[PDB]
């Protein structure tokens, strides 16, 4: 059962670009600990060990190309929410409609 | 059986006020559109209502600002966007002419 296909492919449309709200811009995982970096963009935290850990000194902002640094980032939730009801938003697609989400 | 027979998109709506939650201002306590952040704690506001309060900060959690410049947000912006799609897929436009 597709939901008839009524207004179904619509729908699945917005859930996927949704999803690139609350994407990652360095492994493309979804980010389960939202932090602000000091060029204001979010990340999963861990990225962030590793962008810091690599010998080069102050981390590079993958989504600009620079301007970061250890003591400037910090945990402040804002895109935890967003990241968590959604997928939860795609599953009540799949219950009903039933259709693919991405692969 | 059913007020508007079936209806369907019942989940997805409740879905939709959700996230909804997520971008609906502070201080217009509604959605907003091309929003700031400024709320480096966890609040947030548009880019016409914090400028009128930069001097301090956020007006709940009390924190103070981290962006000097009135910056935006394009996440934030773009998710206002879809929000707006989904409202119509669920009220459903039956028109022919
Ligand atoms: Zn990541
Ligand atoms: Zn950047
Ligand atoms: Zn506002
Ligand atoms: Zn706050």
Redesign the pocket.
Same mark, same amino acid.
């Given at each position: 059962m597709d939901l008839s296909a009524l207004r179904v492919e619509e729908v699945q449309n917005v859930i996927n670009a949704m999803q690139k709200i609350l994407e990652c811009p360095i492994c493309l995982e979804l980010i389960k600990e939202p932090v602000s970096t000091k060029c204001d963009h979010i990340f999963c935290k861990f990225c962030m060990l590793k962008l810091l850990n690599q010998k080069k000194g102050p981390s590079q902002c993958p989504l600009c190309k620079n301007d970061i640094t250890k003591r400037s980032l910090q945990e402040s939730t804002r895109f935890s929410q967003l990241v968590e009801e959604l997928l939860k938003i795609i599953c009540a697609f799949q219950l009903d409609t039933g259709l693919e989400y991405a692969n | 059986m059913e007020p508007d027979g079936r209806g369907a998109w019942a989940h997805s709506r409740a879905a939709l006020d959700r996230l909804e939650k997520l971008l609906r201002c502070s201080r217009c306590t509604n959605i907003l559109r091309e929003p700031v952040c400024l @709320?480096g704690?966890?609040?947030i506001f548009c880019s016409n209502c914090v400028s009128d309060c930069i001097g301090t @900060?956020?007006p709940?959690?009390?924190?103070p600002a981290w962006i000097q410049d009135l910056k935006i947000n394009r996440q934030l912006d773009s998710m206002i966007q879809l929000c707006s799609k989904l409202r119509n897929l669920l009220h459903d436009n039956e028109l022919s002419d």
């Open positions: - | @709320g704690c966890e609040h @900060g956020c709940v959690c009390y924190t």
